[PDB]
Amino acid sequence: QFDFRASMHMLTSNLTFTVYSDLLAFVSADTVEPINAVAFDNMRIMNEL
């Protein structure tokens, strides 16, 4: 049998939010000039110039 007391509930959620997928789109990524690019040892990748 249908019982109103047993069927009435309060559903709770958030009012609104925006879900994002591409996190890296929020990053402005630039690079140094290749002439000035350095390796792990802080020296230029290519030194013969």
Binding site: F4, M8, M10, L11, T12, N14
Partner: protein, 49 residues
């Protein structure tokens, strides 16, 4: 049937509530509750019930 600008989720709940409200065998207390039951939107907290 809300007397205080009430809202419910979802449209099926609205249909059920209207059917119970119009039913003659429904309790008066249940009818008054349907007429008075309210949602609670807390925008500051970003919550909706």
């Amino acid at each position: 049937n809300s007397r205080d600008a009430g809202k419910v989720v979802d449209s099926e709940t609205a249909a059920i509530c209207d059917a119970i409200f119009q039913d003659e065998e429904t309790e008066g207390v249940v009818r008054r509750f349907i007429a008075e039951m309210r949602q609670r939107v807390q925008a500051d907290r970003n919550v909706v019930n």
